Amino acid sequence: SSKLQALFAHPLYNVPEEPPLLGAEDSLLASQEALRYYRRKVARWNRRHKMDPPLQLRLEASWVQFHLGINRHGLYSRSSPVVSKLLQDMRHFPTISADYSQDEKALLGACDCTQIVKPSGVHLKLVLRFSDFGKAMFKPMRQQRDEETPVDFFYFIDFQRHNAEIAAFHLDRILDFRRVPPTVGRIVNVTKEILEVTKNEILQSVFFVSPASNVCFFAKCPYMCKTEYAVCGKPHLLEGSLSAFLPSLNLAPRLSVPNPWIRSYTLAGKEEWEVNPLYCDTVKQIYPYNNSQRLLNVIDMAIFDFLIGNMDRHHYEMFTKFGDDGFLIHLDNARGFGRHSHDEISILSPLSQCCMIKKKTLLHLQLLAQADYRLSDVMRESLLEDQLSPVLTEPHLLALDRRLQTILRTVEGCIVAHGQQSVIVDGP
Amino acid sequence: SSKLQALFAHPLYNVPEEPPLLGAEDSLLASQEALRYYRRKVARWNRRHKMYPPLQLRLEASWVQFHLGINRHGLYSRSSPVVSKLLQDMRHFPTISADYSQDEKALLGACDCTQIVKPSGVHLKLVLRFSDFGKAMFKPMRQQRDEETPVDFFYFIDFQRHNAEIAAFHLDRILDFRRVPPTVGRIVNVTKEILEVTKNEILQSVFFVSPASNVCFFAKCPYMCKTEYAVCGKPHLLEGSLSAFLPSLNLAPRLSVPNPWIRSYTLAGKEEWEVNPLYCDTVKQIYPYNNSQRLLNVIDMAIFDFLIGNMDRHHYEMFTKFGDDGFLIHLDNARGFGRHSHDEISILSPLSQCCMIKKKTLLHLQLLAQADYRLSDVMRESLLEDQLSPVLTEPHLLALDRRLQTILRTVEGCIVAHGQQSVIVDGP
Amino acid sequence: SVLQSLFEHPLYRTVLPDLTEEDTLFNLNAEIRLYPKAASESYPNWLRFHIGINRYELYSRHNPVIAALLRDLLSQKISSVGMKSGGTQLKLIMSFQNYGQALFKPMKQTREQETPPDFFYFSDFERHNAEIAAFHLDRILDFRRVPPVAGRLVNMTREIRDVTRDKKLWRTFFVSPANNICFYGECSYYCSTEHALCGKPDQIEGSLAAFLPDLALAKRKTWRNPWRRSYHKRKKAEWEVDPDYCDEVKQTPPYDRGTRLLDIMDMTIFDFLMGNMDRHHYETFEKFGNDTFIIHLDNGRGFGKHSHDEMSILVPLTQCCRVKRSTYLRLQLLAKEEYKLSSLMEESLLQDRLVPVLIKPHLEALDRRLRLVLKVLSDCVEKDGFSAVVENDLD
Amino acid sequence: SVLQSLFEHPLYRTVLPDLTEEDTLFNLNAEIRLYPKAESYPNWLRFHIGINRYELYSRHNPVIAALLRDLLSQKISSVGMKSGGTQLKLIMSFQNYGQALFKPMKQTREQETPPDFFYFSDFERHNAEIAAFHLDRILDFRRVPPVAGRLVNMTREIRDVTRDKKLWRTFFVSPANNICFYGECSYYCSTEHALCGKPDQIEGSLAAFLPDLALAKRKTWRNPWRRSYHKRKKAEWEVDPDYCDEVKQTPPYDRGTRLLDIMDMTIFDFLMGNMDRHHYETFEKFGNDTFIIHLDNGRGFGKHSHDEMSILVPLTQCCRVKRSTYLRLQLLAKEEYKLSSLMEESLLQDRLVPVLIKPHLEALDRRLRLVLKVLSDCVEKDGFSAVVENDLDG
Ligand SMILES: Nc1ncnc2c1ncn2[C@@H]1O[C@H](COP(=O)(O)OP(=O)(O)OP(=O)(O)O)[C@@H](O)[C@H]1O
Ligand SMILES: Nc1ncnc2c1ncn2[C@@H]1O[C@H](COP(=O)(O)OP(=O)(O)OP(=O)(O)O)[C@@H](O)[C@H]1O
């Protein structure tokens, strides 16, 4: 019984990862410096709201240990008890504050109803704070479970599903990629846990009551352009997805790098890779993809996006401390899991055209194809530990299996054209 | 004294024109047929106006004699006493009716403020009827005398000056082209002679009173788009240009032919002739320009437009009875005479590139360059016979002389490359 | 049979009073002078429709043109298409081979769909279903205050895109990943990519509301409804706090005469039968005076909810409590099983190249909303009495 | 010297009464919470926090002086077109996260509005916006947001720094090889009103941005003397000569501060000739006891050989003014002080001089003496104390 337990007890999910970690220089957050910075922000926070005892910054907090636990090998540890507590905290800890987050806010204005692909700042998302001082990016429910992105919808106008942000985390955990931030689902009292804790005068202005007597709120710019609707509770209850916050950019700077396989983000027109099957022959000769180690990380990201159907991966972020060989952060996955009946093979273009995959990645994929640890069953079980279960409908779960075959078929398919020499990179 | 009398008493303006006219088939209007049709329209007018002594259709009327006097050799006769009466009648006869004219009206709607080059139907022009039953196209005053089309103004947004329609007629008369309809200037009581005689419910609605207590009216579409203003009297008196009406299209059908040298009518982009100096080598091999007689009439039209600076000659109309060799009608010249300091040589592109001019046309141009019959003086005097004198300011008149040199220099200039063989066409 | 019998009733043959040249709108010889020279009663149906607009009705009871005018819109060739400006949602202007024109509201939403409960009245969709349904509803009540509208399956390639010189409308014609053609236009409400109207693959469906005569020779007054919703979240409205509102509004200059008030009553009953709570304005005809009907325009906001009866529309009637006896006897007659509304409405709505224009729940709700209007008249005539609630019209 | 002496008068040192946390606009700590993570705060912030119940800015503030300097020379970060307005007005964003409204040149200095133009057809010109700020400053009203004029480059400061698809698609080059743009507003936003430089400099005014309406809500009141904005059709105040006796019975006009505030404004509008004052905003969080923000002043300074007396009708029908302003208006009529020499002084400190052609500077005194005479011709028919309400007690 329990295919999930068998997966992590497999010799694959237990062998040491090479190269090993010397410490200090392989943990992006320095212990003494980070605790001081978070201690100042607790001091600075305790006033602003004062203008019950004050906040206490404890090392035993979940987000604190999560931030100090980010190493060169990924965001979290393999079968980490820290993340298990972190997920449980974001589900139960009460909220103390709500804001509009950056990425917005810095837009100042800025609504252009003519702009078809308005920037990623005019999207409905908040940043919440809990009693342990930690933060999490809140994405509300925007679609039912048995609902797909309707045909006639381009990728840039696709929705922002909360349940995809959750499932993207579990898939990250099952693949042992360990690159997306932990994410849980939670039912929120939008009045008591969002409105009554926000100090932002704008955010209070977007809360109204429906003719059905429901507490609703909306994104300021999309509501003005009438491109989206509001998000109502029933009448206060609304479910969402909290994604644990990465460390502060003052402690761990990040670098948004544009993907080499961006889309046109237009009603017409295709990019170079969309038309030239020899696109990767050029990519392999451009820095920093000449080291043949950054390209492999993009291949994994392609696999992860194809599994969830995330066409919208224009940029991937990296931690600057880890260098060109550093792993990629798969931050905003809220668009995947929208088409359970369609598989977009253009997402798999990096693997299709470059034709090379990491040794470790291929072994985990082959293993997840066997019925004893098949990808649909281990996901179905892992997602049951969330308050929003079922987070994925049945067509979505089974789709992972079929999309997994397509990945394996492409590997063995283009092995015939290059051999296991140039299609398997068993680097340490 | 009087260089104008010297011009028409010169042997050039007195030699018989070849071929001579046999009659009947060389008068576009058949006498018995035209008199019957015009008599019915007078009968129908007396009925329909009574419902809203009666009119008498006399053969001795100016427009009637003008219409039956249009021959294969032009619109009117050389030094015709009819035209002298026709001009005097349109200046003094009272108005009995005013409408919106066709070309508009058939727009039904039709205001698209996004359209930069809206059709030639959304322009302020009315059709007036006089006591002798004749009609005339009224163009109101839209600019002062000492005012130019300001720089940054494309041709398609240039104004619609009344004094240009008049001066274009006198230049037609002075050149002995005899192709534009007769045009006089007249001061109009816009209340007594337009508003109080219109049966059109829309025309009554566009009349208002200014804060300065002036009777004003406007074009419905351009005022809505705020592209132009209204035209006010002081407070009722307003000057305009009445252009004699051509015969009814039921009696003399016409054929709007597109110019071979149209402009792009866009904020950018050039036509083929604008870039290819060998453009006319193509035109000479396209029907009906292969007979080398229609092309000559287009050359004259270019000369006439260059002298006045009328860039907006997209279409030229022809009488279908006269065939491919028939003369061209220079109908709407309201745009010329706007730049007295600038000469637009692109208008002269037909003569520049084709390099051939009619024998008769060249002799009249050469004659008009000599001080005894110079073009500015004979125009200045001929324009004195108009109530709107001075219809052309001094810089405009002197410009005609200078632009004439450019035409003559162009003839002799490209004569050196082709000789008097292919640059003078002394057809009969 | 039912519709045949309804017009055969003695409550539907009441002729209008005599007329007078002062009761005509404009002298026919003056509208034909506004149109081009063109290319005894062989005038197009849209013209016979215009000259028939008199002081009382907008069209005779059983006109042969109003029937034929609907047929023209169904099948006449589209000449030019242009986008209107300044309106709430997207509405296109059609011009036909016979110089007639009409307003066009597209599909926008399906039949079995309901307006979300969390949508304000000023967020509801304008649907072609309502426009067509309103005309037959108004015709069935013998009000004759709506312009005739008929539904048509239009081709978005040859009847929309390829016959418009509108730079704004045309630049939004894109092809979707489902290989369907879509366009959204450039209005203000739901005019963006994410609300694009698409066919499968190139037929879109919509309604053609006939064009009222040109405002130049038929100026239309525009009056503000005293029960106009505040059109603002949170902020309430006057009629939502004073239960005696009507006792103050029956003192205003134009509502203590007429015909008026009664006209509003005939309208607020209409809007309640549809659920159209977007009635903030009612136009008139100026050249007539304060003694005419109200043109029921922009009906596209009705028929959005079939499981819900928005009682707020009835408040004009519950506060004023008076109706036209002509309409009271009709509304009673339209609730009987031999006549009724559903069987009368599905009859006439069946004669349109768009049936079923109304899913069955809406047709049956018509009887449900009608009996509530009938009951509000009953519950109030016991508190104010007859003769003081019903005003005699016939004799 | 002239300006030096004016602020040295004892009529310009009258401090406001004391304040209270209820008279501040918002807790500064809550406006820094609306902007990104980024008294060393930028000048546009010191300007925002200083907006109290009475003045919009202190008399001789060191920031209001420097705030004008920032708009003159600070780097343009983002440019966006505003929607819903009458004419074209652009939103500018700067390197210091500050923003401002921008109205371009549109018309020259020596030009006059055609006599046949309705009040709702006049141009909105940068001349009026900049002049209105100094005019209001000279009268010590301090009800206008600071505005400064700038020679902007339409290539690097307009076209190449906007992601607005509507605004950019109108940038064409004219037959004079000049760069032009018109935008997509509603009045004079077409090719035939295109704004062009010679060859690529356009000129305009930068009106500082009032604080965000989220934490500084602004009421919007309808002027009781608002013109009908419709040809032929007259207006109420143009037929009842006792209109003011009915408008001083309305709920908010038989208290205040109000009526008097309108008077301080209607005198302002007459000095400029701005007959487009149909709305006057407030600040909501204060109540019915505050000043009126004099916004959208671009329609003034259109006619110098003409004095539009229709603007004065609020004063000729109400006949009452604030004693503070009456003594000032008299003081601003003496040859040692006066308006022209005081107005060309401060207007000389702008990278746009001459912002006002000399006829307008001189007409300023002519409109002032008619206002002063209307006060005199009426104080003889209603008497002092019932025409002037003492406010200077303190
Ligand atoms: N799980 C996540 N999903 C999506 N985005 C994330 C996630 N975690 C972090 N981010 C992004 O990282 C950014 C964090 O920067 P932010 O402005 O919050 O700095 P900070 O950590 O708050 O610094 P300080 O401690 O100085 O306030 C956010 O704007 C957010 O968009
Ligand atoms: N002098 C002129 N300048 C410019 N356009 C002219 C001139 N004379 C006539 N036209 C054009 O010729 C057309 C005349 O056709 P119109 O519709 O007037 O028919 P009609 O001659 O009145 O025939 P009917 O007698 O049947 O009414 C008009 O559209 C007008 O634009």
Residue numbers in the entry:
A (entry chain A): 89 to 139, 150 to 526
B (entry chain B): 89 to 140, 151 to 526
C (entry chain C): 134 to 172, 196 to 551
D (entry chain D): 134 to 171, 197 to 552
Paper's wording?
In an attempt to address this discrepancy, we solved the structure of the Fam20A−drFam20C complex that is crystallized in a different space group. A four-leaf clover-shaped tetramer is clearly present in this structure, formed by two Fam20A−drFam20C heterodimers similar to the human Fam20A−Fam20C heterodimer shown in Fig. 1a. In light of this Fam20A−drFam20C tetramer structure, we realized that the absence of a human Fam20A−Fam20C tetramer in the crystal is also due to an unexpected obstructing ATP molecule, besides crystal packing effects. Both Fam20A−Fam20C and Fam20A−drFam20C only crystallized in the presence of ATP, likely because ATP significantly stabilizes Fam20A. In both structures, an ATP molecule (ATP-1) is bound to Fam20A in an inverted orientation, as we previously reported. Given that Asn298A is at the center of the Fam20A−drFam20C tetramer interface, the bulky glycan addition is predicted to hinder tetramer formation. Nevertheless, both mutants activated Fam20C at levels comparable to WT Fam20A in vitro and in cells. These data suggest that while a Fam20A−Fam20C heterodimer is required for Fam20A to enhance Fam20C activity, further assembly of a tetramer is dispensable for activation.
